[PDB]
Amino acid sequence: XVXXX
Amino acid sequence: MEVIELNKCTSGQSFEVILKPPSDPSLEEIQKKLEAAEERRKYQEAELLKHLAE
Amino acid sequence: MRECISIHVGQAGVQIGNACWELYCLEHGIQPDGQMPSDKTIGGGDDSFNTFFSETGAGKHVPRAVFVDLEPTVIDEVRTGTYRQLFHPEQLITGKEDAANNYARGHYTIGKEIIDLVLDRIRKLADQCTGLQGFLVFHSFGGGTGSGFTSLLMERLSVDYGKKSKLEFSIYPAPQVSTAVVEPYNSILTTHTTLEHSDCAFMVDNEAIYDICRRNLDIERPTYTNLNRLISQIVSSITASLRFDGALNVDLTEFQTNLVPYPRIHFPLATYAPVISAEKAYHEQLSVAEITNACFEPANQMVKCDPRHGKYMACCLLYRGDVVPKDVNAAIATIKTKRSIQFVDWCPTGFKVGINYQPPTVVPGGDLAKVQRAVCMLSNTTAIAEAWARLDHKFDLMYAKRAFVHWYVGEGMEEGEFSEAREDMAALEKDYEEVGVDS
Amino acid sequence: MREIVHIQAGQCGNQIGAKFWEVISDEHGIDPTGSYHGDSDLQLERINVYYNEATGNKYVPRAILVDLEPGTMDSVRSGPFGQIFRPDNFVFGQSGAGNNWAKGHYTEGAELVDSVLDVVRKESESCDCLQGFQLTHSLGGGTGSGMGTLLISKIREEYPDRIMNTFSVMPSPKVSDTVVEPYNATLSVHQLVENTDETYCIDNEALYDICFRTLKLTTPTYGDLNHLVSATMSGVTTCLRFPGQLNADLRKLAVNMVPFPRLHFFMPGFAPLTSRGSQQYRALTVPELTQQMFDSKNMMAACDPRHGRYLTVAAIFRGRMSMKEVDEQMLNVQNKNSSYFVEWIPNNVKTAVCDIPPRGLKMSATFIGNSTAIQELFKRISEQFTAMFRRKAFLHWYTGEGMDEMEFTEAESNMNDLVSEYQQYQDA
Amino acid sequence: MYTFVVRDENSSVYAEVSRLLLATGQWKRLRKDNPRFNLMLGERNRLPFGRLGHEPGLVQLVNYYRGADKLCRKASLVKLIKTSPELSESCTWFPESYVIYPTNTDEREVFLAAYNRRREGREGNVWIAKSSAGAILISSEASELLDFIDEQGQVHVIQKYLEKPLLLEPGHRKFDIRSWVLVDHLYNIYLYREGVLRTSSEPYNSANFQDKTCHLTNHCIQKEYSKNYGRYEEGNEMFFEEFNQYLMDALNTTLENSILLQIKHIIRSCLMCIEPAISTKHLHYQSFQLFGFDFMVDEELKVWLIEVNGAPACAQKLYAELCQGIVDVAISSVFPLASIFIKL
Numbered sequence A: 001x002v003x004x005x
Numbered sequence B: 001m002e003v004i005e006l007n008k009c010t011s012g013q014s015f016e017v018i019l020k021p022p023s024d025p026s027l028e029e030i031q032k033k034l035e036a037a038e039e040r041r042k043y044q045e046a047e048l049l050k051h052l053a054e
Numbered sequence C: 001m002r003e004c005i006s007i008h009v010g011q012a013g014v015q016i017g018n019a020c021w022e023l024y025c026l027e028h029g030i031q032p033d034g035q036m037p038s039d040k041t042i043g044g045g046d047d048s049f050n051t052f053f054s055e056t057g058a059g060k061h062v063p064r065a066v067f068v069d070l071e072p073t074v075i076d077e078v079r080t081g082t083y084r085q086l087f088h089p090e091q092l093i094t095g096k097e098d099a100a101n102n103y104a105r106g107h108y109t110i111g112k113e114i115i116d117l118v119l120d121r122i123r124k125l126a127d128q129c130t131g132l133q134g135f136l137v138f139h140s141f142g143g144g145t146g147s148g149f150t151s152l153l154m155e156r157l158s159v160d161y162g163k164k165s166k167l168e169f170s171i172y173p174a175p176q177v178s179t180a181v182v183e184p185y186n187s188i189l190t191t192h193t194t195l196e197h198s199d200c201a202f203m204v205d206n207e208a209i210y211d212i213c214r215r216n217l218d219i220e221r222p223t224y225t226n227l228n229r230l231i232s233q234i235v236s237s238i239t240a241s242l243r244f245d246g247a248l249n250v251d252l253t254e255f256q257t258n259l260v261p262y263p264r265i266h267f268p269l270a271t272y273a274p275v276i277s278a279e280k281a282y283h284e285q286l287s288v289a290e291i292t293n294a295c296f297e298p299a300n301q302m303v304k305c306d307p308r309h310g311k312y313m314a315c316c317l318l319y320r321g322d323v324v325p326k327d328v329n330a331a332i333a334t335i336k337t338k339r340s341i342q343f344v345d346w347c348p349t350g351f352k353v354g355i356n357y358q359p360p361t362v363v364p365g366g367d368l369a370k371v372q373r374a375v376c377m378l379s380n381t382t383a384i385a386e387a388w389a390r391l392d393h394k395f396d397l398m399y400a401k402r403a404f405v406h407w408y409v410g411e412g413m414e415e416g417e418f419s420e421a422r423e424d425m426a427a428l429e430k431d432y433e434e435v436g437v438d439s
Numbered sequence D: 001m002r003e004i005v006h007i008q009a010g011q012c013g014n015q016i017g018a019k020f021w022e023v024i025s026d027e028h029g030i031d032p033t034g035s036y037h038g039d040s041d042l043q044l045e046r047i048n049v050y051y052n053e054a055t056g057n058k059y060v061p062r063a064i065l066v067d068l069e070p071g072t073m074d075s076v077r078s079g080p081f082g083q084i085f086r087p088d089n090f091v092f093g094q095s096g097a098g099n100n101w102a103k104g105h106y107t108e109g110a111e112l113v114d115s116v117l118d119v120v121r122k123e124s125e126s127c128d129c130l131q132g133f134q135l136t137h138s139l140g141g142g143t144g145s146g147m148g149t150l151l152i153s154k155i156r157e158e159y160p161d162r163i164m165n166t167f168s169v170m171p172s173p174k175v176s177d178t179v180v181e182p183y184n185a186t187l188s189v190h191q192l193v194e195n196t197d198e199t200y201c202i203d204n205e206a207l208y209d210i211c212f213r214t215l216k217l218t219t220p221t222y223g224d225l226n227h228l229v230s231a232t233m234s235g236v237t238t239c240l241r242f243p244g245q246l247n248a249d250l251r252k253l254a255v256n257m258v259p260f261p262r263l264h265f266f267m268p269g270f271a272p273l274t275s276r277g278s279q280q281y282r283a284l285t286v287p288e289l290t291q292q293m294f295d296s297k298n299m300m301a302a303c304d305p306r307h308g309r310y311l312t313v314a315a316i317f318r319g320r321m322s323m324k325e326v327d328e329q330m331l332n333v334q335n336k337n338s339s340y341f342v343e344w345i346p347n348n349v350k351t352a353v354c355d356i357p358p359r360g361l362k363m364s365a366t367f368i369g370n371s372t373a374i375q376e377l378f379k380r381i382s383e384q385f386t387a388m389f390r391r392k393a394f395l396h397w398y399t400g401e402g403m404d405e406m407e408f409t410e411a412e413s414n415m416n417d418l419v420s421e422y423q424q425y426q427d428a
Numbered sequence E: 001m002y003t004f005v006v007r008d009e010n011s012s013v014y015a016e017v018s019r020l021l022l023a024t025g026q027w028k029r030l031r032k033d034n035p036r037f038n039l040m041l042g043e044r045n046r047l048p049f050g051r052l053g054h055e056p057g058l059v060q061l062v063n064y065y066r067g068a069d070k071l072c073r074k075a076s077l078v079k080l081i082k083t084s085p086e087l088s089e090s091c092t093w094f095p096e097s098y099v100i101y102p103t104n105t106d107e108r109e110v111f112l113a114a115y116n117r118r119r120e121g122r123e124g125n126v127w128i129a130k131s132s133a134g135a136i137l138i139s140s141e142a143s144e145l146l147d148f149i150d151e152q153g154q155v156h157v158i159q160k161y162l163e164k165p166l167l168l169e170p171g172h173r174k175f176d177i178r179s180w181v182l183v184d185h186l187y188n189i190y191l192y193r194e195g196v197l198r199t200s201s202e203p204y205n206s207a208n209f210q211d212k213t214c215h216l217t218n219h220c221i222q223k224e225y226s227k228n229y230g231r232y233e234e235g236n237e238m239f240f241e242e243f244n245q246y247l248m249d250a251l252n253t254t255l256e257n258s259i260l261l262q263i264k265h266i267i268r269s270c271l272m273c274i275e276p277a278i279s280t281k282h283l284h285y286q287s288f289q290l291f292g293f294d295f296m297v298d299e300e301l302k303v304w305l306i307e308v309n310g311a312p313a314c315a316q317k318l319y320a321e322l323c324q325g326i327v328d329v330a331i332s333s334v335f336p337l338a339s340i341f342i343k344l
């Protein structure tokens, strides 16, 4: 699971 | 019914109305408790700081 | 003339104190400057209002009052209050770290560090009294300071002023405006410790005054300001005899005499009428017999209970304003019939009456309408015991699991003191029971 | 009980810490340079709680930024409010913690901890009356988790009578694929049961599910997850930041929320749920704020409150609304779902109403529940933990830094006790 | 949705009402000690009225009137009927009585003056002994049972036996009528149209007095102490419809005129008297309560009040109709959802 502001 | 003790004045009056008749601890002693809690509390804080020292 | 020093403790005590001394000033015609045009005894006097006010050469009338709060925010508002010139700095005492709704914290921890400063500031007033008759203590049951530090102070005053009188104005806790879960703890705790040091105590359930404010003043969400101005009207009725010239309840000793046969059972139920909305331009002028009858309707009581299923030991009627004895004694004759008033078999089944010709003053711009006549009944009925029962059940529920107890133990208090205070209360409910029910 | 000292440790800690300051700064009308430009005066009444004052009456956050690598803090310093923070209150190393609790708590972090406590001490002396500290951090990494708990243990030693508060981000495989996070989290929990008075359990499993299911974001970002945290943090501290009557300081909150010293892990909820893209043109009704704030969908902890019982509840409503109607709906939930509230704590639900609403909303409701259902969270971590520990997997990363298997067993054991303790009172 | 609790499970009546409440799908039942309830089916005794009406935002109702014990307990009722002006000592419908505390406010014994007032008497006189427990003796000579009272520790009361009761034929049988009365929170006095005759099984003879069971008409005595049951009426429970028909074909009258008017009168008199003492019109909580009045009729068709049952049981036949009726009038009037009574 890829999650950057 | 009986009215009694009619006390009057310029600022008010009062009376009684009957319908039927009948049918310490010391100063130091206080402080002994205030310090008995300061110690109990200082102890529980010593045990924490003791636990934290570990 | 015998002086009375008023002691306001905690948030509740100080805020109610303001409602009172504000009302006092309106009734005695004292300005926000402390100046009194009506008064001519400049510098000093033997008047009856001098029992609550001292006098200065400049002509200022200064409340014989001390304010205390472990938190500075509340008392700070007095300092910049609309009535700020009245009080001088030495009267307003403030800490910085409050008691966080913890009795133990207010009694033991924070309490020890300020008890000797407050007694010092009280002593400075006692040394301005020619014949001090006693103290009037204002506080809450639920607060940390109100419950904790109060019980500490009462213990000291029974030593420093052993033969002087001490009367209590106490706010009983109601969930509808309470701000803590542990208020039932702080309540039982402070009562047990204070019981032997209080001669007469007037309980006020926030619940009652809240509903009264809802019902009779048409207020949706009553603020404390709403709750307080109502309380002051009550308190005024109790103290008017000390501040004005009268023959009933003329000094603090008479309160214990008239209302308190059993020293432990010293919690008279207060009932007051008429409470009228000010928004109502026209309000029906309730007659003497009408407001006298209202004294027995629970909806007007300072504590919601049922006097019908209790017995009386005393009963006072304090009328203020346009009232004459003929209308009074008439209404008394009536009520004995319609209403269930049983006295104890060792008391005369009667009423002590008093009238104060000056009528109930109201704060300009308030929620209470000025009325021509009003009454405040002080009945020492056993029905008030219902309030102790309520409070004690909530106590036992939480304590069975020792919930929140660690907060108290952590302040150096002992878990045994909880048991000590609860078993003391269990005796009070028994005493109330032995006096007012058929075996 | 006046000033609070804020600390943020690690990547997660500094990101949510920064976002938290971004939000409340806007609410208190403080601009990035630190000058005040707001309408209402309610904004400046209790400003001293989180901010210090300086020359030119500039407002500086009472915040200490901690990390073992310069990455996130360089980004924060070049962030939006970057220049607001006290430059000296940036305390960072270079080695990094490598998502290792041991590195953060015993070796790499021990090498830096003293320097941080110097900044803590300097801020604590500026205080007229210190309440305590709030820490923001994740439990899944190394710095925030390991070094964070170390700082707590050390701070409790210098300030044992102060209150220790934490916003702790719990790990979830739905958000991170790092295998050792359950080790880090279990070790941290042990520390938190012992050395904090209040801990807000911010669960990344919840934040993700909220973002994906409710807010319909197919690829949730950290910014999306943090928008929720930021909203929660604002609401939870509202009673602290503006004039109020209930839970107005950390100790009073703790006394109301914590019936037992170890059970201080709160379940935060919020409504209306919002995304940075969501419009929110239609303000919610008071009944709607209430039904949602108690709804599991709005819980930030990913626990089903119907599986446990509420020991205590704090509810905070924001915005101009009928305070009358608030009481009725609050009393309605209690009386409707009375079975889910423990009977042996009468009136365990307390409510406050602040007039100033959060940024972008007219009506908002925040939830703080000490539910026994929080155990489901600790149960989740415990299983992920044992799955590896029964085979002693990945332990060499930790033993290499000086730790021993026994220290794991004790942390595992203590958190199993916590779960059982939460269960003891659920059947009461 | 509504919430209620139960604290008396040994009650036959409210076990049924509790059953019917749950059948509406609008009444959830709580644990017996949950404070956040709307209704309370409280306990017969020790009911804590002091805790009701103090829960914010909860309208609270209960199935008992505080202070109602003054009318239901034996010694209290008597003291009430003579001390209360609304019911003169010279009460037409209540038999002569005097309160009796053992040797251990003793009215003991201005009562004896009444006996020697019947030493001049040719009007026979016999006085009973009944009191608290279910476990009662009857004879002319007073001193006999005065020992029986001084024996046990309970408090008692003595009252003239009705020597000429109405006798049902065939059988020459004694009986008494049980009427059920419901009072709501508005103090509307409702009478259940259906009543029952607790008839005696055997003929009534004034010969023998000791455990003679033809004197007493209790369900417990008639079933246990007699080989006589169901001969004339099943259950010894003759309902009003039959008693009505009998009185016409026998004495040429109706239940309505001969008996019911007098019944309906005593009900009003008793409850209106205690009304200001127990009413919840202005209280922080509200009350309602089911009562069971026991009446005796004599050969002159004059009705007498025996006692008032505070915790009455119902006839098996009338449960479904009455317990349903209680919900309509007492509970649903206060707690609305989404006649078999007679107002007085």
Ligand SMILES: Nc1nc2c(ncn2[C@@H]2O[C@H](COP(=O)(O)OP(=O)(O)OP(=O)(O)O)[C@@H](O)[C@H]2O)c(=O)[nH]1
Pocket (backbone or CB within 6 Å): C009, C010, C011, C012, C013, C015, C016, C069, C070, C071, C098, C099, C100, C101, C102, C140, C141, C142, C143, C144, C145, C146, C147, C171, C172, C173, C174, C177, C178, C179, C183, C206, C224, C227, C228
């Ligand atoms: N009637 C009335 N009740 C009040 C008022 N202020 C507080 N209370 C009640 O008092 C209880 C809390 O006690 P407080 O007086 O606020 O606390 P405290 O004495 O300042 O002690 P601390 O714990 O240190 O704050 C609650 O049950 C409130 O409902 C007030 O101004 N008027």
Ligand SMILES: Nc1ncnc2c1ncn2[C@@H]1O[C@H](COP(=O)(O)OP(=O)(O)CP(=O)(O)O)[C@@H](O)[C@H]1O
Pocket (backbone or CB within 6 Å): E095, E128, E130, E131, E132, E133, E134, E159, E160, E161, E162, E163, E176, E215, E216, E217, E218, E294, E296, E306, E307, E309
């Ligand atoms: N003055 C009187 N005249 C005739 N019968 C009388 C009487 N006083 C009492 N009794 C008798 O008392 C008998 C039983 O009545 P009781 O007072 O026991 O009521 P009850 O059993 O239905 C309720 P409980 O006994 O539990 O209090 C009646 O059948 C009646 O015959």
Ligand SMILES: Nc1nc2c(ncn2[C@@H]2O[C@H](COP(=O)(O)OP(=O)(O)O)[C@@H](O)[C@H]2O)c(=O)[nH]1
Pocket (backbone or CB within 6 Å): A003, D009, D010, D011, D012, D013, D015, D016, D097, D098, D099, D100, D138, D139, D140, D141, D142, D143, D144, D145, D169, D170, D171, D172, D175, D176, D181, D204, D222, D225, D226, D229
């Ligand atoms: N919500 C949120 N979680 C984060 C963020 N950064 C890291 N995390 C979580 O924190 C854990 C990793 O800890 P991290 O803070 O990166 O390591 P640290 O620098 O050693 O403290 C993982 O479970 C991540 O999901 C962030 O910005 N927001």
Ligand SMILES: [Ca+2]
Pocket (backbone or CB within 6 Å): C039, C040, C041, C042, C043, C044, C045, C055
């Ligand atoms: Ca003067």
Ligand SMILES: [Mg+2]
Pocket (backbone or CB within 6 Å): C010, C011, C071, C098, C143, C145
């Ligand atoms: Mg306070």
Ligand SMILES: [Mg+2]
Pocket (backbone or CB within 6 Å): D011
């Ligand atoms: Mg990283």
Ligand SMILES: [Mg+2]
Pocket (backbone or CB within 6 Å): D095, D111
């Ligand atoms: Mg190194």
